[PDB]
């Protein structure tokens, strides 16, 4: 179409028409001569470590959001709409910023998720619990909110999606940041013997903690301490209450020897290093959580070469023919590890979804979004699971990727800027 | 870089600099606001079913190629170069087209493959056998060349890459087309009982053949007849000599019951429906072949829902728990089917490569191409295998995709145009 883009499913031949892309103003990183679809950080809005948006750069963005928000409730042009535009406008003029009402914040958070093109679990987007932490002023206050978020979200295993929003960035005053990449994660330690204990992905953070006084248990699965930063002040260490950290011992439903591998993982995945942008406002500390898709742990966390990298050990115990890759011993061990993960979480009755169920519901979500919103931004490279790709329905689904706002963006690691 | 694009491997942290993209003039389908990286046919050059390039549209393209060809041999600007440019130019003026010398044709074919961004086996690109069939004038002549190609390429199981190039398109005279999607493929028949015998992907072609007199054996693995079109004349049916069609009975190295499934596949993959473009010239009939990557058969050909779709049967025989997707019975059966395929071809000593070995050599190829050519166009969506994606090195490799020429493009199915 000369404006209406079509995406087809090559497995079912269903074709959809996308008009929603016409509302994108942000750049993807691609040009008519080159495609950057497989670049992790095409740095098209990875949040500038620079200053902060100015009054002139903030009102247009603030206005774009309100127009969008009010059109949502079918009140575009209303007095309320125009009244609100004048308030924010006048408010930005005097304070160089503005405050979102509670309703606009909830709408913005849900849509940041709704617009997350790399997220396969968006069918859940409208069911998000928003915790307003904008009145927080210290690291102890942040610790409290986080513990409450973790308890709520965990819900004794029956996981519930949630996000806690700390004060937005200002200019000078300074901002809030959760130095951890995820609320709950395991430490990593580079052994002197060239070995690496724990999660290799968290070695640089583990060092920051240790230097701050953390008493690393020097174990394989040590839950890291929270390193919180409020109002641009130095970060502070806090130990999330163990009773609040739900974990699952990994065992196999057929291989009794699997237990002995000593594998375990935490049940609540919670991202804490991203930035939430709503109406030109930037919320640099907005930890959010949902639940795991089995492959995140079984394929990536456990089998990534630069992660726990457990394929050999498992393969050995299975007495596999690891003399040639053609035996597919890696693939075979990979399937068992993922069967163990699902079986375990399900046994402990901790919420989790397998890549088969997760991808099918995403297709349903896409069809829903095309019907009611005119489209759905999706990043194929990220939506397709790291194992058994073509046996899942998303592999055969063409997807259009574009940037819509509100949204979640990436931001510089706090220790690569924060002074002192 | 303000011109030098960088691709990184997130598993090894190696970063490469791409300058080669600066030589792309063709469009990818993406824009700064939207990415079409997962669209199968972004119709950016899927060969226009229209007329044919004119003299004015042909010389610039012819010139671009020669300049490229002569720069290859480090003779840009030479007398030979300029002499050749004037010949082709003058030749296009009188005949409205031109003829590539043997050397330019071989260089062009190898580079069409070298530039194939969706191909994971390009490390082999410089080792291609080029068969010049430009003197062919009838369907019988095409049949002969094809049989010879198949015999050469097959080489009794020790497969060798090759391509046979029939006469280029002209204007009126008319062109050559191999109506088959691949030289060797199985027929498909829609059963009256809603069933579908054979390969569902080939049902429409099987009908064309049958209507042309083909005596379909109405079996599950019936090698289709060749339907050749020379000089725009109606296509003619030919039966490739069975002794020339190498096939492999699929059996498992542990499950003796696998044999009984009656699975078999042919050893030579040969694409015959694409169009080769060199110097503005279009070779609408240029069948090419190499060898299989295990997953093409085991994952896609056998397990695609719209293909043989054999996951249940296999799963049943394995006595798997197919009551819930969480058991990963599909994944488990998928690994065994692929172990069977590799084991079988290897047993019969027919060339084949597993996704692990194939993807690692592609990484090596990429590193080679960045060193000597300044880059390598790669389509991530296609390069990453349909199973166990993240355990292969290409999954963690960022790839830049752009169109370089010479190249292989798609073209309209011959029966959707050819009259009579
Ligand atoms: C309801 C359950 C949910 C599931 C199963 C789910 C699953 C996923 C998965 C598998 C990924 C890939 C993660 C990776 O590869 O590292 C992902 C990415 C993402 N999810 Fe979801 N998600 C859910 C809820 C949420 C929530 C509550 C939010 C936000 C409010 C969210 C925002 C995102 C974002 C921003 C990404 C992209 C991360 C990036 O770009 O680095 N997800 N999700
Ligand atoms: C030497 C062994 C080779 C291997 C293992 C290999 C493997 C592959 C694989 C796995 C695909 C995916 C096919 C699909 O998903 O349908 C592919 C695509 C492709 N290969 Fe190669 N290849 C090889 C040789 C060749 C040769 C000889 C040529 C041409 C001279 C070639 C040209 C291409 C092209 C054009 C595509 C893209 C197809 C499309 O866009 O639809 N390949 N190759
Ligand atoms: N299923 C989840 N897991 C999850 C989601 C997102 C991420 C973030 C992955 N970020 C990768 C990345 C890519 C590029 C640059 C950077 Cl800094 C980071 C991690 C786990 C959920 C997390 C919160 C809700 S669901
Ligand atoms: N390994 C091979 N297999 C193979 C390569 C390419 C194709 C072509 C796949 N085309 C898919 C497609 C995609 C979009 C539109 C159309 Cl018409 C067709 C098939 C098998 C080789 C074939 C020739 C040499 S290697
Ligand atoms: C290089 C490539 O973009 C990178 O490895 C991507 C591929 N797809 C992914 N998909 C998900 N869900 N998560 C990831 O971290 C990645 N990594
Ligand atoms: C929709 C999506 O682009 C499509 O299913 C692609 C994905 N990757 C692929 N990769 C290869 N090698 N072959 C294919 O046919 C496909 N299909
Ligand atoms: Zn793109």
From Swiss-Prot, chains A, B:
Role description: Produces nitric oxide (NO) which is a messenger molecule with diverse functions throughout the body. In the brain and peripheral nervous system, NO displays many properties of a neurotransmitter. Inhibitory transmitter for non-adrenergic and non-cholinergic nerves in the colorectum. Probably has nitrosylase activity and mediates cysteine S-nitrosylation of cytoplasmic target proteins such SRR. Inhibitory transmitter for non-adrenergic and non-cholinergic nerves in the colorectum.
Official protein name in the record: Nitric oxide synthase 1
Family per similarity comment: Belongs to the NOS family.
Localization annotation: Cell membrane, Sarcolemma; Cell projection, Dendritic spine
Transmembrane segments: none
Post-translational changes noted in the entry: Ubiquitinated; mediated by STUB1/CHIP in the presence of Hsp70 and Hsp40 (in vitro).
Residues of the full protein shown: 298 to 716 of 1429
Binding positions (L-arginine): 182, 291-292, 296
């Amino acid at each position: 179409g000369p404006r209406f883009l079509k995406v087809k499913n090559w497995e079912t031949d269903v074709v959809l028409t996308d008009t929603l892309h016409l509302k994108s103003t942000l750049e993807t990183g691609c040009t008519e001569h080159i495609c950057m679809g497989s670049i992790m950080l095409p740095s098209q809005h990875t949040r500038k470590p620079e200053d902060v948006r100015t009054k002139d750069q903030l009102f247009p963005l603030a206005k774009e959001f309100l127009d969008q928000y009010y059109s949502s409730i079918k009140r575009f042009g209303s007095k309320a709409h125009m009244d609100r535009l004048e308030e924010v406008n006048k408010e930005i003029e005097s304070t160089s910023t503005y405050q979102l009402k509670d309703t606009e914040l909830i709408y913005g958070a849900k849509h940041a998720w709704r617009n997350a093109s790399r997220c396969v679990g968006r069918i859940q987007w409208s069911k998000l619990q928003v915790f307003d932490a904008r009145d927080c002023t210290t690291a102890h206050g942040m610790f409290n909110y986080i513990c409450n978020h973790v308890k709520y979200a965990t819900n004794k295993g029956n996981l519930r999606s949630a996000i806690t929003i700390f004060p937005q960035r200002t200019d000078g005053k300074h901002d809030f940041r959760v130095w951890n990449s995820q609320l709950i994660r395991y430490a990593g330690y580079k052994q002197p013997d060239g070995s690496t204990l724990g999660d290799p992905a968290n070695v640089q953070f583990t060092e920051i903690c240790i230097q701050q006084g953390w008493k690393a248990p020097r174990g394989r699965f040590d839950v890291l301490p929270l390193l919180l930063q409020a109002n641009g002040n130095d970060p502070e260490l806090f130990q999330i209450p163990p009773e609040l950290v739900l974990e699952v011992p990994i065992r196999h439903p057929k291989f009794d020897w699997f237990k002995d591998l000593g594998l375990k993982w935490y049940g609540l995945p919670a991202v804490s290093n991203m930035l939430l942008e709503i109406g030109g406002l930037e919320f640099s500390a907005c930890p959010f959580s949902g639940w795991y898709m089995g492959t995140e742990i079984g394929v990536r966390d456990y089998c990534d070469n630069s992660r726990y990298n457990i394929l050999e050990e498992v393969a050995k115990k299975m007495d596999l023919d690891m003399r040639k890759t053609s035996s597919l011993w890696k693939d075979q061990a990979l399937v068992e590890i993922n069967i163990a993960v699902l079986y375990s979480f399900q046994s402990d009755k901790v919420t989790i979804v397998d890549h088969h169920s997760a991808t099918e519901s995403f297709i349903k979500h896409m069809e829903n979004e095309y019907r009611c919103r005119g489209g759905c931004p999706a990043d194929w490279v990220w939506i397709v699971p790291p194992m058994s790709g073509s046996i899942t329905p998303v592999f055969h689904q063409e997807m259009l990727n574009y940037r819509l706002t509100p949204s979640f963006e990436y931001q510089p690691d706090p220790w690569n800027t924060h002074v002192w």
